Design a protein around this ligand. Structure first.
Ligand code: SF4
Ligand code: F3S
Length: 106
C-alpha cells in the first residue's frame, strides 16, 4: 500500500485521486488516506502529490510511521473520494510546515 503522510494535512490538493486506477482514497476534512487493502501499489499517485506526501509503506520516514496505521484506520470511517476538487484555501501556506498531525480533523 501507499501511505499519505503529514504534509497532506491542511493542503489536501487531491491531485492524487485522478490517477488512482482503483479509487482507494477516502476523504477527511483536511486530509486524505489510502485504503491499504484496496491499493494495488501501482505507484502512480506518488509523483502527482504537490505536497510530496505519498510514500510506499516500506519507504515511510521513521518519524512518520504512525501514518501507516492512521491510513488503515481512517480509511474505514471516511467517505470514498473519486474526483479531484480544489485545494484547501491556504494549502500553500501550510505546504512544508512540519508537525501538522496536531491539526488533523476527524
Ligand atoms: S499506489 Fe496506485 S492504487 Fe495505490 S493509492 Fe496510489 S494510485 Fe491508487
Ligand atoms: S496533498 Fe493530499 S489530497 Fe493527495 S495530492 Fe497530496 S496526498
Amino acid at each position: 500500500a501507499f501511505v499519505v503522510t503529514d504534509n497532506c494535512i491542511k493542503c489536501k490538493y487531491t491531485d492524487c485521486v485522478e490517477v488512482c486506477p482503483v479509487d482507494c482514497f477516502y476523504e477527511g476534512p483536511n486530509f486524505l488516506v489510502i485504503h491499504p487493502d484496496e491499493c494495488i501499489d501501482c505507484a502512480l499517485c506518488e509523483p502527482e502529490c504537490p505536497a510530496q506526501a505519498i510514500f510506499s509503506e516500506d519507504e515511510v520516514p521513521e518519524d512518520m510511521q504512525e501514518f501507516i496505521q492512521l491510513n488503515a484506520e481512517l480509511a474505514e470511517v471516511w467517505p470514498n473520494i473519486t474526483e479531484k476538487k480544489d485545494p484547501l484555501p491556504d494549502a500553500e501556506d501550510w505546504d512544508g510546515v512540519k508537525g501538522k498531525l496536531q491539526h488533523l480533523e476527524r
